[PDB]
Design an enzyme around this catalytic site. Structure first.
Site, PDB file in Angstrom:
ATOM      1  N   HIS A   1       0.836  -1.224   0.000  1.00 22.30           N
ATOM      2  CA  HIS A   1       0.000   0.000   0.000  1.00 22.30           C
ATOM      3  C   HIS A   1       0.849   1.243   0.000  1.00 22.30           C
ATOM      4  O   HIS A   1       0.572   2.135  -0.757  1.00 22.30           O
ATOM      5  CB  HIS A   1      -0.938   0.001   1.230  1.00 22.30           C
ATOM      6  CG  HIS A   1      -1.678   1.294   1.499  1.00 22.30           C
ATOM      7  ND1 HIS A   1      -3.041   1.405   1.337  1.00 22.30           N
ATOM      8  CD2 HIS A   1      -1.273   2.478   2.050  1.00 22.30           C
ATOM      9  CE1 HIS A   1      -3.430   2.622   1.716  1.00 22.30           C
ATOM     10  NE2 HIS A   1      -2.381   3.297   2.156  1.00 22.30           N
TER      11      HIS A   1
ATOM     12  N   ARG B   1      -2.899  13.673   3.541  1.00 20.36           N
ATOM     13  CA  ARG B   1      -3.671  12.533   4.026  1.00 20.36           C
ATOM     14  C   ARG B   1      -3.720  12.570   5.551  1.00 20.36           C
ATOM     15  O   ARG B   1      -2.783  13.035   6.201  1.00 20.36           O
ATOM     16  CB  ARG B   1      -3.042  11.208   3.548  1.00 20.36           C
ATOM     17  CG  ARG B   1      -1.564  11.052   4.003  1.00 20.36           C
ATOM     18  CD  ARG B   1      -0.945   9.685   3.721  1.00 20.36           C
ATOM     19  NE  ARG B   1      -1.376   8.682   4.690  1.00 20.36           N
ATOM     20  CZ  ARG B   1      -0.777   8.476   5.865  1.00 20.36           C
ATOM     21  NH1 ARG B   1       0.302   9.193   6.212  1.00 20.36           N
ATOM     22  NH2 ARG B   1      -1.240   7.543   6.695  1.00 20.36           N
TER      23      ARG B   1
ATOM     24  N   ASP C   1     -17.163   3.144  15.926  1.00 19.23           N
ATOM     25  CA  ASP C   1     -18.232   3.482  14.973  1.00 19.23           C
ATOM     26  C   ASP C   1     -18.261   2.410  13.880  1.00 19.23           C
ATOM     27  O   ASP C   1     -17.424   1.505  13.887  1.00 19.23           O
ATOM     28  CB  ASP C   1     -18.034   4.889  14.369  1.00 19.23           C
ATOM     29  CG  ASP C   1     -19.345   5.624  14.173  1.00 19.23           C
ATOM     30  OD1 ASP C   1     -20.104   5.796  15.172  1.00 19.23           O
ATOM     31  OD2 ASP C   1     -19.666   6.042  13.040  1.00 19.23           O
TER      32      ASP C   1
HETATM   33  C1  HEM Z   1      -1.062   8.479  -1.410  1.00 15.71           C
HETATM   34  C2  HEM Z   1      -0.568   8.717  -0.215  1.00 15.71           C
HETATM   35  C3  HEM Z   1      -0.689   7.619   0.850  1.00 15.71           C
HETATM   36  C4  HEM Z   1       0.309   7.187   1.617  1.00 15.71           C
HETATM   37  C5  HEM Z   1       1.771   7.689   1.551  1.00 15.71           C
HETATM   38  C6  HEM Z   1      -0.270   6.182   2.525  1.00 15.71           C
HETATM   39  C7  HEM Z   1       0.462   5.527   3.493  1.00 15.71           C
HETATM   40  C8  HEM Z   1      -0.065   4.752   4.460  1.00 15.71           C
HETATM   41  C9  HEM Z   1       0.700   4.130   5.469  1.00 15.71           C
HETATM   42  C10 HEM Z   1       2.216   4.316   5.555  1.00 15.71           C
HETATM   43  C11 HEM Z   1      -0.131   3.406   6.240  1.00 15.71           C
HETATM   44  C12 HEM Z   1       0.214   2.541   7.465  1.00 15.71           C
HETATM   45  C13 HEM Z   1       0.168   3.448   8.663  1.00 15.71           C
HETATM   46  C14 HEM Z   1       0.168   2.637   9.916  1.00 15.71           C
HETATM   47  O1  HEM Z   1      -0.371   1.541   9.990  1.00 15.71           O
HETATM   48  O2  HEM Z   1       0.658   3.070  10.935  1.00 15.71           O
HETATM   49  C15 HEM Z   1      -1.467   3.575   5.721  1.00 15.71           C
HETATM   50  C16 HEM Z   1      -2.630   3.047   6.241  1.00 15.71           C
HETATM   51  C17 HEM Z   1      -3.875   3.147   5.665  1.00 15.71           C
HETATM   52  N1  HEM Z   1      -4.158   3.787   4.461  1.00 15.71           N
HETATM   53 FE1  HEM Z   1      -2.920   4.953   3.285  1.00 15.71          FE
HETATM   54  N2  HEM Z   1      -1.624   6.013   2.231  1.00 15.71           N
HETATM   55  C18 HEM Z   1      -1.903   6.899   1.205  1.00 15.71           C
HETATM   56  C19 HEM Z   1      -3.113   7.043   0.591  1.00 15.71           C
HETATM   57  C20 HEM Z   1      -4.214   6.305   0.947  1.00 15.71           C
HETATM   58  C21 HEM Z   1      -5.495   6.255   0.263  1.00 15.71           C
HETATM   59  C22 HEM Z   1      -5.923   6.954  -1.045  1.00 15.71           C
HETATM   60  C23 HEM Z   1      -6.280   5.450   0.953  1.00 15.71           C
HETATM   61  C24 HEM Z   1      -7.741   5.079   0.619  1.00 15.71           C
HETATM   62  C25 HEM Z   1      -8.642   5.556   1.479  1.00 15.71           C
HETATM   63  C26 HEM Z   1      -5.547   4.970   2.098  1.00 15.71           C
HETATM   64  C27 HEM Z   1      -6.104   4.164   3.046  1.00 15.71           C
HETATM   65  C28 HEM Z   1      -5.496   3.649   4.156  1.00 15.71           C
HETATM   66  C29 HEM Z   1      -6.163   2.854   5.184  1.00 15.71           C
HETATM   67  C30 HEM Z   1      -7.644   2.428   5.268  1.00 15.71           C
HETATM   68  C31 HEM Z   1      -5.080   2.528   6.202  1.00 15.71           C
HETATM   69  C32 HEM Z   1      -5.248   1.636   7.457  1.00 15.71           C
HETATM   70  C33 HEM Z   1      -4.878   0.204   6.980  1.00 15.71           C
HETATM   71  C34 HEM Z   1      -4.890  -0.738   8.120  1.00 15.71           C
HETATM   72  O3  HEM Z   1      -5.777  -0.626   8.931  1.00 15.71           O
HETATM   73  O4  HEM Z   1      -4.076  -1.606   8.363  1.00 15.71           O
HETATM   74  N3  HEM Z   1      -4.281   5.482   2.062  1.00 15.71           N
HETATM   75  N4  HEM Z   1      -1.381   4.393   4.597  1.00 15.71           N
HETATM   76  O1  LIG Z   2      -3.378   6.082   4.863  1.00 17.62           O
HETATM   77  N1  LIG Z   2      -3.840   7.329   4.247  1.00 17.62           N
HETATM   78  O2  LIG Z   2      -4.825   7.725   5.184  1.00 17.62           O
HETATM   79 CA   LIG Z   3     -22.086   5.239  15.470  1.00 20.13          CA
END
Ligand code: HEM
Ligand SMILES: O=N[O-]
Ligand SMILES: [Ca+2]
Ligand code: HEM
Ligand code: HEM
Ligand code: HEM
Ligand code: HEM
Ligand SMILES: O=N[O-]
Ligand SMILES: O=N[O-]
Ligand SMILES: O=N[O-]
Ligand SMILES: O=N[O-]
Ligand SMILES: [Ca+2]
Ligand SMILES: [Ca+2]
Ligand SMILES: [Ca+2]
Ligand SMILES: [Ca+2]
Lengths: 241, 241, 241, 241, 241
Positions: free
Chosen positions: B163, B176, B185
């Site tokens: 991801h 972000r 929730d």
């Molecule tokens: C484009 C720039 C983005 C970067 C650099 C990025 C990076 C990251 C990173 C590094 C994490 C892990 C953080 C952690 O667990 O402590 C994360 C988690 C997450 N990201 Fe992104 N992300 C980006 C965009 C997005 C987009 C477009 C979405 C779609 C909504 C998204 C959805 C999520 C979600 C739902 C998690 C939680 C995943 C989990 O629960 O294990 N991210 N992101």
């Molecule tokens: O992990 N982008 O919220």
């Molecule tokens: Ca609620």
């Protein structure tokens, strides 16, 4: 007679959670009748001192489909009905629509009993809530699929054993109560929680999201209702202004 | 004190997103009271200067189910509730119903940390928005299934490194923020984005759509809310006419 | 001529269950016209003495999407329609919205007949409802998937012998009726029950949830409607105040 | 400056489809005020001559959840928003509720380009609609599952070569336009058709339902919206009486 | 010039079913303006003598989301739109909301044609209804999944021969008409039945529930609409008191 300390501790107790949402024509009830609304619920709760136990929670500002909700406990479902029916004739009652209702009943322990799982049971019964009075309530209705129910009691035990293992530790943090509903309403369980530490509550759910049991949920929330704990009259006073 | 720089950067901060839709009887509020509306909201935000951080965004014309929506940051959930509760007593609050609410909490990094994925974590923290101020806000609730959560923290880490990889690039383009909600929730996460390049943002989502992690989503939108960034009074000044 | 004892017992009888929810502007009907609304329903039911059989149940305080509900039994669906149609022109009728309608027909035994399953036929037909005049009604629509209907009658039979077995002990406890619906409405079956022991009923449904047959349900509730038994005039009296 | 023929041809163009439903209280705006609704729209379109391209379609009598809907094309989503926001301030706009909004953006060819699929790209580009001017419009949002998206570019191209093979023929009959939405709204695509032959159009979808790609659709309509093409004033004239 | 025997028999015929629910303020139309509303609908139908064929069915008392519904048949979908649009301008029309619309079109036989399935096709055309004027109508929308449509026409033919074998017998008993909708609305087909024997009709659905074809349905009802056949003027006369 109905004592809080007992009725919340016993099997055969009916829980009736009802979530209400105030209609827009409430802000047009005359400030006078609205302020007098709280005392009226308070007297209604007193008038049924001996029929039901009443709790009342504030979700306005935290929830799309509710402003406040009740938790009724009763030895007799009919009586929980009569209270609610009378609540709805209240000034506030006449101004709110019902958005959720969950009926459940309390039962003896099915898995983590002294007989079946003595180890974890000693843990469960001798653990004691610590620190601040809980400011938040969470209510989660939970329903498991036909696959779950068709596993043998041994297998289901194993899994509930797995439910208990990381969660016993959160008992210093979170208060719990389990109602049962299969056959009675559109869920298998209603769970009720009180805690002051929402970060800890999150971690608690993540713990449970991560074990095989979670694979059988067809409902785990929807809604997840999290609002805030007060006295019956305070909730209504806060709805008023 | 609640400094915008600090509160948006720390763990243990609650986000409460609330989508509101204006009722038709708002057009019949006297063009006078309506024009006085923006100032009333501005004043409310000042009063709560020190309890919560407030953002307001304009979605009328781009969303079926909201005309505008708030983002609230708080260290105390109860305080977010108080603000929101006071907002809905306002002239505009009185003429809008709630269509969505999402409550979430900030946490430390779970996977792409200095300890667990040092290489990617460095690209992450040393990446920096470039160019025109973003005009667009997107907010996306995300829930993953039991199967995801039943993967080993080793397996989920590998997936989340997947991801992070093609997305680091879009940090010049897209800001972000991540909130956590499981148990608080009806969602696992609340994601928040500001960008000026929607075509870029479309490519960004497609990138993520195409990796294994996507296979586990049971909610990834619904609603996907994209609206437009302005000062709070300006959002209300636009709903005026 | 329609005798309650016969029509509830015979094949080819149409059942029409209709859940009503009272609109808020019923509280604004003059209290006088509201008290008079009971006699009105009572006279209408006398008017169709010989057209339909009428039962009416109180769900207010126990159900989100009804305050009351009818069970009509008729030899001719058209007569059920007239009845219902005339009720909706009644004073209460004019103040409630329909929230659910189930149409069904009574049939002879498909599985646990004397020819096909003699042993269990004996059990079922011998032990009789003892115990208190039932205070609670339950109504559960049930619909099975195509996989089920595609199993051979020999396979579905074995499955219904497994359904029957655990239920035999609740014959003193719970009263049942089964209507058939596939092709007449959006469910395969409408099930109807009367009991005084909700814990018992919960146990019964848990026993059913745990057999293979439960694997094939696509609907088994939604809504599960549970409410309270009273004379039709008494139900409307209950809605009045 | 915005020429119809240019903007409908170019990449990077925002589509904003908005399906509106008139409220009852429109039949009580006086005929006269209602008939002057058509010029007000016509004047708003001229006002936004250089910001957006406006299309308006009649769906009343043909669709449950719209009486009419707009298609706006813009170089700036913000300008789509403004136009839409200003239409909702219009006499007609004040008596209609939004029931669906789809946002999207035009892109270059992903699959059937000169580079990747020269044979089919030729066939597509060099084909032109024949015969009577289209009376009907159809708008169909489409979303494909995580599984589609996790297939390789090579595998997906093959599948879109399959989509394109039986559909080329229908370009004599049917006009098409393809908007992209992933991450911008709750759908992968927004598809747009104009035809005069609905029986053709039916054969066209069946052609598509019959291929592998249709196996990954999780949304493919809902709503499928079919209405009738008229000048914008003609659409408001029709809604007036 | 439109002849009922002819238009109901020919291919290329547009069917437009629409289910309407009367609004509560219809009971406040002075009775007589209400009874006189039938005349208005009668005149509208004769005014459209030449444009569309019209049918009207009474569902009040048997359906949750309709009091009545129309069946329109036309050679030109536009004209159905005009008809309907003009009905909603009617006194009754101004007091009803639309709750469902299905658009579809008649086509030549796909499976059970003289060429493809000569024997069943003969049995089909030479089958003739006996018994009383049908009292009941049922309208069922059906959608099949991607797996069905991805089956070759050989495999689907076999399956339709299977649909047709136990069903021919019911042609003495039940009347059917099949409309086609893929791409024109949110269903694959609209099915229309007229019967006097509802036990029979139930048995007919169960016959069809029990074949492989049923395995591929993703919509098969929802709503299953069963109402009562009368003349148009009689259905409105009925809605009146
Ligand atoms: C484009 C720039 C983005 C970067 C650099 C990025 C990076 C990251 C990173 C590094 C994490 C892990 C953080 C952690 O667990 O402590 C994360 C988690 C997450 N990201 Fe992104 N992300 C980006 C965009 C997005 C987009 C477009 C979405 C779609 C909504 C998204 C959805 C999520 C979600 C739902 C998690 C939680 C995943 C989990 O629960 O294990 N991210 N992101
Ligand atoms: O992990 N982008 O919220
Ligand atoms: Ca609620
Ligand atoms: C952290 C404190 C918790 C503890 C100590 C705990 C412990 C238990 C125990 C010991 C049981 C078995 C009771 C019995 O069989 O008699 C149980 C059952 C159950 N728990 Fe919890 N739990 C906790 C939190 C949660 C949470 C967060 C949920 C999520 C909503 C939950 C939902 C349920 C449900 C639905 C059952 C019934 C399972 C079944 O029907 O077989 N519990 N829990
Ligand atoms: C507890 C007392 C009960 C008894 C004695 C009982 C017994 C039976 C029997 C003997 C049949 C077969 C009838 C036939 O084929 O002609 C049947 C069918 C059926 N029962 Fe029950 N049952 C009981 C409770 C329940 C409950 C609690 C439910 C769940 C709501 C239920 C749901 C159904 C359904 C949906 C069918 C139709 C099955 C089919 O279509 O093939 N029963 N029951
Ligand atoms: C007969 C007229 C049609 C032709 C000639 C046609 C052709 C094409 C072509 C060439 C593409 C690929 C464009 C690209 O990748 O750059 C495409 C994509 C697409 N088409 Fe059509 N199409 C037709 C009708 C339809 C219909 C009826 C639908 C149903 C709503 C549809 C839905 C879509 C969707 C959703 C995509 C994007 C697929 C993806 O994202 O990978 N098309 N079409
Ligand atoms: C008992 C009287 C019935 C007869 C004689 C009958 C006969 C047929 C025949 C011959 C066809 C194929 C026509 C063609 O391909 O052009 C057909 C198609 C169809 N029938 Fe029936 N049918 C009957 C009842 C029903 C019922 C109760 C339903 C349930 C809704 C139904 C649903 C359908 C559907 C959805 C199709 C189209 C299948 C497809 O799209 O490929 N029919 N029927
Ligand atoms: O087991 N806590 O409901
Ligand atoms: O299965 N007794 O309805
Ligand atoms: O791919 N037709 O939009
Ligand atoms: O095939 N009967 O619609
Ligand atoms: Ca129905
Ligand atoms: Ca219920
Ligand atoms: Ca959106
Ligand atoms: Ca449609």
């Amino acid at each position: 007679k109905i004592e809080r300390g007992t009725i919340l501790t016993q099997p055969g107790v009916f829980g009736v959670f009802t979530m209400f949402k105030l209609r827009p024509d409430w802000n047009k009830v005359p400030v006078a009748e609205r302020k007098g609304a709280a005392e009226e619920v308070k007297k209604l709760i007193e008038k049924h001192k001996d029929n039901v136990l009443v709790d009342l929670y504030l979700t306005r500002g935290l929830e799309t489909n509710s402003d406040f909700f009740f938790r009724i406990n009763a030895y007799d479902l009919a009586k929980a009905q009569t209270f609610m029916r009378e609540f709805r004739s209240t000034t506030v009652g006449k101004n709110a629509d019902v958005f959720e209702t969950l009926v459940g009943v309390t039962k003896p322990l099915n898995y983590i009993s002294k007989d079946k799982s003595p180890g974890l049971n000693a843990g469960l019964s001798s653990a004691t809530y610590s620190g601040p009075a809980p400011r938040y309530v969470i209510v989660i209705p939970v329903k498991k699929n036909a696959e779950w129910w068709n596993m043998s009691p041994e297998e289901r035990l194993k899994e509930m054993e797995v439910h208990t293992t990381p969660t016993l530790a959160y008992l210093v943090n979170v208060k719990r109560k389990l109602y049962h509903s299969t056959g009675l309403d559109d869920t298998d369980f209603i769970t009720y929680f009180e805690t002051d530490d929402l970060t800890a509550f999150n971690n608690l759910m993540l713990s449970l999201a991560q074990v095989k049991e979670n694979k059988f949920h067809v409902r785990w929330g929807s809604p997840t209702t999290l609002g805030t704990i007060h006295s019956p009259e305070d909730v209504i006073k806060a709805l008023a202004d």
